[PDB]
Symmetry: D3
Subunit: 252 residues, 6 copies
Amino acid sequence: HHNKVRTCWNEGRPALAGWLQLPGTLHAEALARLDYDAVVIDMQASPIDFGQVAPMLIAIELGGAEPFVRTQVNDPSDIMKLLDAGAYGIIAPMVNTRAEAQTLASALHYSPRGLRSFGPRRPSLRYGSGYLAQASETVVGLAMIETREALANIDEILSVDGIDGVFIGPTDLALDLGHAPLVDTEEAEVVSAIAHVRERAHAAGKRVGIFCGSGGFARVKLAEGFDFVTAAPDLAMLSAAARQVIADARAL
Amino acid sequence: HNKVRTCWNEGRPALAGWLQLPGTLHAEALARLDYDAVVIDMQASPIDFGQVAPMLIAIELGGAEPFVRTQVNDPSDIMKLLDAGAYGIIAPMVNTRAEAQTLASALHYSPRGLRSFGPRRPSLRYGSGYLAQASETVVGLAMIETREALANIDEILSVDGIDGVFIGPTDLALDLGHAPLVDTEEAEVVSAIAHVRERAHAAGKRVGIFCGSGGFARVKLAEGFDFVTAAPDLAMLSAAARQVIADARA
Amino acid sequence: HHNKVRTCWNEGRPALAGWLQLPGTLHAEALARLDYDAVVIDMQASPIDFGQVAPMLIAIELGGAEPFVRTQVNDPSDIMKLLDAGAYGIIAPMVNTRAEAQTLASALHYSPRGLRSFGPRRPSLRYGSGYLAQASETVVGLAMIETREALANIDEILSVDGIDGVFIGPTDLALDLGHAPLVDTEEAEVVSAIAHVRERAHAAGKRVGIFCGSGGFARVKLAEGFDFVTAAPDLAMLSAAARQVIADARAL
Amino acid sequence: HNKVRTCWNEGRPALAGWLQLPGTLHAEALARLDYDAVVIDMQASPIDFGQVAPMLIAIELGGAEPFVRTQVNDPSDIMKLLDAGAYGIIAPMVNTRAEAQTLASALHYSPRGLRSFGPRRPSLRYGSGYLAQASETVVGLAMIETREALANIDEILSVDGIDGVFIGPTDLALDLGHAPLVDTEEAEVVSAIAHVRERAHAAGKRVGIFCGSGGFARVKLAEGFDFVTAAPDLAMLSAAARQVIADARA
Amino acid sequence: HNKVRTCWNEGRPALAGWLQLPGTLHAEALARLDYDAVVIDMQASPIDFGQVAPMLIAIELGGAEPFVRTQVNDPSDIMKLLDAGAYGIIAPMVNTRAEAQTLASALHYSPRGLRSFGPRRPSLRYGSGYLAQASETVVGLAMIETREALANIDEILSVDGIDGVFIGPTDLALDLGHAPLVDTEEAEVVSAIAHVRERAHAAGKRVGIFCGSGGFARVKLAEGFDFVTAAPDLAMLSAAARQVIADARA
Amino acid sequence: HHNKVRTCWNEGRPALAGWLQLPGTLHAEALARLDYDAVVIDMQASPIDFGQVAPMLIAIELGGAEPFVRTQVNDPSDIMKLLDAGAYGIIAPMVNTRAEAQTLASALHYSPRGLRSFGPRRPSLRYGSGYLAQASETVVGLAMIETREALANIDEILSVDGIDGVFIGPTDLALDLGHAPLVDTEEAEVVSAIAHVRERAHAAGKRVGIFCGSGGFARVKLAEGFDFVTAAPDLAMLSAAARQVIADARAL
Ligand SMILES: [Br-]
Ligand SMILES: [Br-]
Ligand SMILES: [Br-]
Ligand SMILES: [Br-]
Ligand SMILES: [Br-]
Ligand SMILES: [Br-]
Ligand SMILES: [Br-]
Ligand SMILES: [Br-]
Ligand SMILES: [Br-]
Ligand SMILES: [Br-]
Ligand SMILES: [Br-]
Ligand SMILES: [Br-]
Ligand SMILES: [Br-]
Ligand SMILES: [Br-]
Ligand SMILES: [Br-]
Ligand SMILES: [Br-]
Ligand SMILES: [Br-]
Ligand SMILES: [Br-]
Ligand SMILES: [K+]
Ligand SMILES: [K+]
Ligand SMILES: [K+]
Ligand SMILES: [K+]
Ligand SMILES: [K+]
Ligand SMILES: [K+]
Ligand SMILES: [K+]
Ligand SMILES: [Mg+2]
Ligand SMILES: [Mg+2]
Ligand SMILES: [Mg+2]
Ligand SMILES: [Mg+2]
Ligand SMILES: [Mg+2]
Ligand SMILES: [Mg+2]
């Protein structure tokens, strides 16, 4: 009866999260049982549709991590349907303005404050009869910052009451700033924009998260005081692992 | 051409991947690496027929030969996989000459076997001349994973329509009364594995083995195994995630 | 060659409809064969995606009820794709203004009147060569009223020619009015808003429907003159049935 | 711990649900009620392997022991379900000692049985010590639903690696030449059911029975059945919908 | 009423479609044409159990009798399809009297067969009186596609609980040592087909045949075949696409 | 390492494309192996959802045709998710204005020019390390013209840099112009509108495509100088083929 990520935050500790682009329940449960606080299912940059995400949410919860979803789009109806299938964290892409941040917030919180239509099939099964009274505490909402526009509007985005904070896509932001889409980019202008977003989030009493393609980059983001750090995509980790096995198999 | 048969004909072994996770994205990604084949495991996995069919397509597009380790040595299951574009079959728990004949029966059209004719996907790959070359398009391996199979190895190896045998050494270790550890050092298990390889090669047949690491696969390739698998997607992903978490958390 | 709900209405009788949150064909056919006029597949408050709804529509039609869908969102493209998969009724959520009601109407009716793109795979198979001439008669459209805003705008929503009327979500409306989200709520201010919506719908010569969580509440709504009454969700009925079986099994 | 085995060890019977409808939402909802187990029916249903795998996860998360009544008493089917996190197996049409041995063979690793080693989901639940306790993590029941099974009951009950027997009384009623009605009063069927229960308990084994109502389940629990199912999701949903329509329409 | 049995009782043959492509849209479209039945092929196809179940519903809604050519002559597979609303079964590779008895066993409730009782979809179509008329609701055909089946035709035809036999002439052609061409002119294959039809009709049983063209189907209907299939969806779609491309490109 | 449709266009030849309304991999591969340059998966007028389209894209590529998709809606997030699953052509429905054309263009092209979020799972596997440098060349984008509005706005739609041109739905346009929704319509006012769209596209140095229900209509469109011609839907071709087989089987 607690959001493991919110528990980290209440204890003044960051959360570390997995990131899934591969559909299916077996790896979702296996990674959830590791020392991840949360596992993010990527519904944007992946072939994962609503039918495949539903059982993955169950597998992550059984594994003992907080099931999160990076949605395809910042659409209230998509977000609310995921919340009712038992997503306890939402990362909404392309939140560029305060109004888009307000749209995310609307989807996360019960009417009349939010417009979250009531029908909590899975949350009411997990939280029991105590759910409705603490329902907002059960869910984490992060607005994705991945554009020039979002960067310029960071303070108005952070001003929105009903979001926990923001989530940086460093490669997506590098590309929108006119740089190479390097995994775990350290391009100086992107490094500077990222540091600005983290400063403004902590200045507003809000959380800041970031996507990492490696354990090494995630270690640095944790040291820099990021509150929510993802590492690393299942497909990327599996492809790298297979490449290393083949090289060792084929070595003189 | 069957890329594994191409390896063998050019005098080199095949290195293969091993998938227990369903879906097309990782199957294509791994097939595009320096694997000659990718085995889809329909036994020690939740991969059912519906999920295997597009995975076979993904492996072929990625540039590896699609193989299936079947749930069971059942002719009608095997034939449906061949018609879906499985070009390699690894049949579990082949323990007797009769069971190896059952496998051989599934892999060949009459008069050589009793394979039903309806080659939906192979006929698209090979065209209207498929029948004449059908047997050579597919590689068939009988799994050796029990004391009984070990006792019956020459009788199994005598069956004409199988390419050879594939050692399941974790199951074999367990059946011999040892720890079911992959890549085992247990002297009796190592001896049995070497014995199967020698008997296969003496009978002019191929021998494969399931491996859990690149380092063990390198040794098996050095010992002259024709078909070596390393390592299951779920095992490699789990190990990689554990290492990323250790790096992140310091 | 008739919409069973429209047949009820033409005979001056209300329609009673089932409500499905569980994906699959077997229970959809079984409930369709009961004395339901229609069965509503809930694509909003459920894990039911487009791939699972398509065969459920077939199962409901074979069972001999009118297949209806409560859409995830009032989006024309989603609605038109359901109509072409053989949804003969649409309930659109969160219709709060005349313009949102016009958007629903646009999706229900053939170009140029509506913008219903032409490609009626399943309807043309059911209705045959007579379909196009009577196609608007084959489909029922209800705008969901579940907000303060929709309540204030009820007359402008009801003014839209191409919708059959409105569908009340009593729990969703209770919550937006600042009350407890009680199943089959009789909270006085919600009771009053619901009676106002029914009065204004009948005043405009339009139909009014309502969601019920029980046969008892549905009986009262039918007596109050509601034209389309749903009772009760498959998950709710199955959970209650199992709870009663266990209590009888475990009783002294 | 297997919650059904926990019931038995603490001297109480298990009450189980019975699912013929595929999907995770109702499976989790019913598992969260006061059921010790939830049986997924893969025989008298459209539930295939792809649909069962996430249903097992949903039942375990809801707090009941996931059981499967298999389509058939086939070792390789049973083993794939065990590796998917089926912790109870009810095998249909077990009619002879040989067929009960076939069931027992699937449920245990060598040397006790021939269960293939690849415990994808149990190893996540039980960890690396799974092998040592594997047999106790799973409950195996042979279904008695024919005159032949009734005639061979002591020979079936003699097989070491099965927990006992599960009566399918509608099939049994039909095979005895009576109406296939659930929860039957037919004297010969009632007598046969009592006979099986007595023989099971005399042989120190468990006996279960399929029920269509809470009232019948209460009697079976009173008569000392160890494992009682009530009632199929589709039957309960259909009855509930009929009652709601009767209430609505007056 | 089984529409194929209605054809036979009114003294006309049945013409059936044949589906190798999964999904409901084409299954309903083809069932709405002047086909008496539509056969779903679960053998020479990627159609698994999950995909067949809604296809049966689509065929019935479209106004044809849903039939399945099973992957294999396996009683438990057949029974699950009957409970899903398969009203016709074509069992492949029925080669002996024993194998025909195995088929017959699956199609009938005790005492006539050993069909397990759980008629999920038939009980919705036929209601509570289903048991009494169950056997007549289903049509069972043993496939003749081997020299062995041809040699054992009268022994196969002697089995009481099968309606008759369905010739797989491409497999039969191949097994006789000829080209596996549909609608063949090969004299020995044509002679064998005629022989099977004569023996079936002499034994008071029905005979069907798989066809690749309307023109061949017309001849078979003229020769007195009771059940004629023309032609597979994938073959017809491929031929139609080739013709559209030829018309477009000139 | 080339878009087969772009190859046609660079050689000054039209492309001929298949059109799939039936889900599944077997017919998709079989038709892709025929003399089609591209095969279009119809996600609008079909029951094909995201889960079924993903493997169909693979089957078409393996068959040796360019995998295209006609999207349910002109939504950037839906389009980008298809591009990352290996759609190399996009047909967006109901593009009625320059702004809707700009929205399509935004989805097709990498940030910062487009807003195409970076995560090319399948394209980077096909094109290898050379992908990012030539990524815009790998994808074809066509704005669907199927309304009076789109017809009036054709020049402002064609003015948008980042679209390859337009795709005519003759039946959809006939219906919006107040005519019969005839397959391969030759209704004079629709014939005139279609000729105007082709003239204005070629006048703007842009490509024009068209949907055909037959090989005969497609032959005429190819002769009229259309750059991209689809013929004919799998369901339509299969239904016609089965009808002809039955008539030949049942003939005296
Ligand atoms: Br860990
Ligand atoms: Br990123
Ligand atoms: Br590599
Ligand atoms: Br032997
Ligand atoms: Br092994
Ligand atoms: Br391993
Ligand atoms: Br009723
Ligand atoms: Br409500
Ligand atoms: Br309870
Ligand atoms: Br016995
Ligand atoms: Br029973
Ligand atoms: Br029952
Ligand atoms: Br016709
Ligand atoms: Br015989
Ligand atoms: Br044949
Ligand atoms: Br053919
Ligand atoms: Br061609
Ligand atoms: Br059109
Ligand atoms: K889906
Ligand atoms: K964890
Ligand atoms: K490769
Ligand atoms: K009804
Ligand atoms: K429980
Ligand atoms: K018909
Ligand atoms: K081609
Ligand atoms: Mg709502
Ligand atoms: Mg055959
Ligand atoms: Mg359109
Ligand atoms: Mg094994
Ligand atoms: Mg039974
Ligand atoms: Mg992005």
